[PDB]
Design a protein around this ligand. Sequence first.
Ligand SMILES: Nc1ncnc2c1ncn2[C@@H]1O[C@H](COP(=O)(O)OP(=O)(O)O)[C@@H](O)[C@H]1O
Ligand SMILES: Nc1ncnc2c1ncn2[C@@H]1O[C@H](COP(=O)(O)OP(=O)(O)O)[C@@H](O)[C@H]1O
Ligand SMILES: Nc1ncnc2c1ncn2[C@@H]1O[C@H](COP(=O)(O)OP(=O)(O)O)[C@@H](O)[C@H]1O
Lengths: 109, 109, 109
Amino acid sequence: MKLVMAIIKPFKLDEVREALTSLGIQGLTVSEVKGFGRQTEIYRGAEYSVSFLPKVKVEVAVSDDQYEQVVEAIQKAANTGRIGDGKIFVLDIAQAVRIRTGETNTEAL
Amino acid sequence: MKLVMAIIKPFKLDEVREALTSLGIQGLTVSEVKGFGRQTEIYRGAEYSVSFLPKVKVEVAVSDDQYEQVVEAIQKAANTGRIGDGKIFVLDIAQAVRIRTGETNTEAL
Amino acid sequence: MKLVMAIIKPFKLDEVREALTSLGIQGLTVSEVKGFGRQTEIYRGAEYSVSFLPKVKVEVAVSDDQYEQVVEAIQKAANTGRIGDGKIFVLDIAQAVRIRTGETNTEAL
Ligand SMILES: Nc1ncnc2c1ncn2[C@@H]1O[C@H](COP(=O)(O)OP(=O)(O)O)[C@@H](O)[C@H]1O
Ligand SMILES: Nc1ncnc2c1ncn2[C@@H]1O[C@H](COP(=O)(O)OP(=O)(O)O)[C@@H](O)[C@H]1O
Ligand SMILES: Nc1ncnc2c1ncn2[C@@H]1O[C@H](COP(=O)(O)OP(=O)(O)O)[C@@H](O)[C@H]1O
């Protein structure tokens, strides 16, 4: 099992969701985040960040047989070719549980 | 060390916290998230998500000796038996640091 | 590759960003979170959390050659020596992709 974590432009969320649904992946968790990457105001000694780049973090747990296709689908849907498109990170999941049923691992996803 | 990540119904957060406290686990980090799983409006070409399912993400770093009990306690407390109860994912933590002291690994948790 | 996840006091975010920039790390993702660690109101049977400790979660993907220095820089910048300074967790990243280009792994970071 893998956790696919994507940081994308907020306006690409619906396209990414659609691409994942077409793969049979409809369960995902979305977080609002602030990005720093490629305005500040100096107040009482230090530089203070006064503007931020909004991004969306998409997290989806998927099987080892699914993860490569999921990464590909997110990359293709979230791409603009312009700066700030974001990143996809894949991490290993050791164990999973479906809270409603107690089902575990692949059967929980 | 393990990172236990649970996505739960917001109204179950206090019950989950209480269950973890009873185990001697009081340190945890909570994020507000949006869930997609088991309303849209069509505007200028595409389907736009106009409603979301609020969920809470609970993240707690725990020792290898603790994680199984923690997963069990969260599952039991967050369960309703109804759709949308959520998921628990366990991931491996390679290293941990307590910022205040520089303590590492188990002694940081 | 490693994902360095730090939970810090919100007023330390700019100092942490500056320390990371000095290392040549400018890409990071920040989340607003609620902390529980070291007020409640009883309503209709149960204890309800009515106050929360705001924290910031900093997530930065870095190379195996960089991660130790990154952990050190965050710890030093975020430290006050007072309760609540927070935690740093390091997790393994299996794969990474830059959405704009399709670049992978170290070249994506
Ligand atoms: N190494 C990293 N770790 C964590 N988040 C990152 C990293 N690099 C980029 N990000 C996230 O991706 C966003 C885009 O990064 P940026 O360098 O601006 O564009 P690009 O990915 O096209 O080079 C950032 O705003 C940040 O949220
Ligand atoms: N594979 C997954 N990856 C990430 N988050 C998920 C996944 N499946 C479910 N979730 C999260 O759990 C919530 C509940 O999922 P859902 O399928 O609606 O109910 P159930 O878990 O009872 O089948 C979703 O709203 C989403 O936040
Ligand atoms: N085991 C843990 N897992 C996840 N988050 C934690 C853990 N311990 C602490 N935290 C986060 O770090 C914050 C500070 O923890 P606390 O125990 O209050 O102070 P200190 O880290 O100085 O002992 C908490 O509010 C919470 O957000």
